[PDB]
Design an enzyme around this catalytic site. Structure first.
Site, short mmCIF file in Angstrom:
data_model
loop_
_atom_site.label_atom_id
_atom_site.label_comp_id
_atom_site.label_asym_id
_atom_site.label_seq_id
_atom_site.Cartn_x
_atom_site.Cartn_y
_atom_site.Cartn_z
CG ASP A 62 -2.20 -0.84 1.01
OD1 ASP A 62 -3.01 -0.67 0.08
OD2 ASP A 62 -2.37 -1.73 1.82
CD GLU A 93 -4.15 0.91 -2.55
OE1 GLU A 93 -5.28 0.71 -2.14
OE2 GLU A 93 -3.36 -0.04 -2.77
CG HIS A 96 -6.36 0.06 2.08
ND1 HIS A 96 -6.46 -0.50 0.83
CD2 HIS A 96 -7.60 0.53 2.38
CE1 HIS A 96 -7.71 -0.36 0.39
NE2 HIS A 96 -8.40 0.31 1.31
CE1 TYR A 100 -3.21 -4.66 6.37
CE2 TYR A 100 -2.12 -3.08 4.91
CZ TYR A 100 -2.97 -4.16 5.11
OH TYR A 100 -3.61 -4.77 4.08
CD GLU A 161 -4.97 -1.20 -6.02
OE1 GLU A 161 -5.27 -0.75 -7.14
OE2 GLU A 161 -5.43 -0.74 -4.89
CD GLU A 195 -6.34 -2.55 -2.63
OE1 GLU A 195 -5.51 -2.71 -3.57
OE2 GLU A 195 -6.80 -1.43 -2.31
CG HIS A 198 -8.66 0.15 -5.42
ND1 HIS A 198 -7.70 0.62 -4.55
CD2 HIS A 198 -9.82 0.73 -5.04
CE1 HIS A 198 -8.27 1.40 -3.65
NE2 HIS A 198 -9.56 1.49 -3.94
#
Ligand code: FE2
Length: 300
Positions: A62, A93, A96, A100, A161, A195, A198
């Site tokens: 990402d 992105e 995302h 994490y 992706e 994703e 995308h």
């Protein structure tokens, strides 16, 4: 020069994708991940490590897709409506990437986070897969690009992706489907849902450009696509092997990789490469049931 004008269609799909993309917006604050500790602390060393590794790996991807891939592809598009959608996809992105960290922050301490980022950074396989993708973006760093060069940067983006994430998404799905780290699985499920639209969308853009290549550019572009697939397949098989042998999952992650490689190709309007393998029923269950959709207080 030209201002984006959403009242006059530039194509038949950008508006529908724009609306789908924004309708899916979410941010880590909407998912507390702290009750995942209970199942986190039941896992073994080897399972923890593996989960940290694949998440560090997803973060790198990402990082690149939102900081180079979308900026460098969109900036050369003349379609302002498609341009707006790619711009928004890039921001997500980054949403995302940062989720994490949101997960890491409940699972691991500072020192443990440090090691993950250090391992990710110095990792030779991640450099190789990420570099392969990235070199297609870095090729667009100049005032004018060929159609071929733009097509290929889009091939690489859909490979990233729709395909390259999935050796990593396997693990959190695998655990969620079994009741383990399910808040995180929810976050991972929202990421997948972004994703995968995308991938569809750039696949569409890739296909319009394809239709405008010379007959023989089309050949070079086919040929180069296939070799790119298989050169990433080769590095995904080594990646698989080194991440997943210590917890016995290699061949299960592998089938999931080829399965996604196929959706990747299909997104590009290309014939599947691997024969139809079934997906691990416990990952199926993580995907189907560990969703934010299912997560609410019943009023019954
Ligand atoms: Fe993503």
């Amino acid at each position: 020069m030209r201002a984006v004008n959403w009242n006059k269609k530039e194509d038949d799909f950008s508006l529908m994708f724009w609306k789908q993309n924004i309708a899916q917006f979410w941010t880590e604050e909407e998912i507390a991940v702290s009750s995942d500790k209970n199942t986190w602390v039941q896992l073994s060393k080897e399972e923890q490590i593996a989960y940290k590794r694949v998440l560090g790996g997803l973060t790198l991807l990402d990082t690149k897709q939102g900081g180079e891939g979308m900026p460098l592809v969109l900036v050369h598009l003349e379609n302002l409506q498609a341009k707006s959608v790619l711009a928004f996809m890039g921001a997500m992105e980054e949403v995302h990437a940062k989720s994490y960290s949101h997960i890491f922050t409940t699972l691991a301490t500072e020192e443990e986070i440090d090691d993950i980022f250090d391992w990710v950074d110095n990792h030779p396989l991640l450099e190789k897969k990420a570099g392969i993708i990235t070199s297609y973006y870095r090729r667009l760093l100049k005032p004018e690009v060929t159609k071929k060069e733009l097509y290929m940067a889009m091939v690489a983006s859909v490979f990233l992706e729709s395909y390259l994430f999935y050796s990593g998404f396997f693990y959190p799905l695998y655990l969620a489907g079994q009741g383990k780290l399910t808040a995180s699985g929810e976050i991972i499920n929202l990421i997948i849902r972004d994703e995968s639209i995308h991938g569809v969308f750039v696949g569409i853009l890739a296909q319009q450009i394809f239709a405008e290549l010379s007959a023989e550019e089309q050949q070079e572009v086919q040929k180069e696509t296939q070799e790119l697939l298989m050169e990433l397949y080769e590095i995904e098989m080594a990646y698989t092997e080194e991440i997943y042998t210590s917890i016995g999952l290699v061949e299960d992650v592998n089938r999931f990789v080829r399965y996604n490689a196929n959706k990747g190709l299909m997104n590009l309007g290309l014939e599947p490469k691997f024969e139809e393998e079934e997906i691990n029923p416990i990952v199926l269950n993580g995907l189907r049931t560990d969703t934010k959709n299912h997560d609410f207080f019943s009023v019954k």
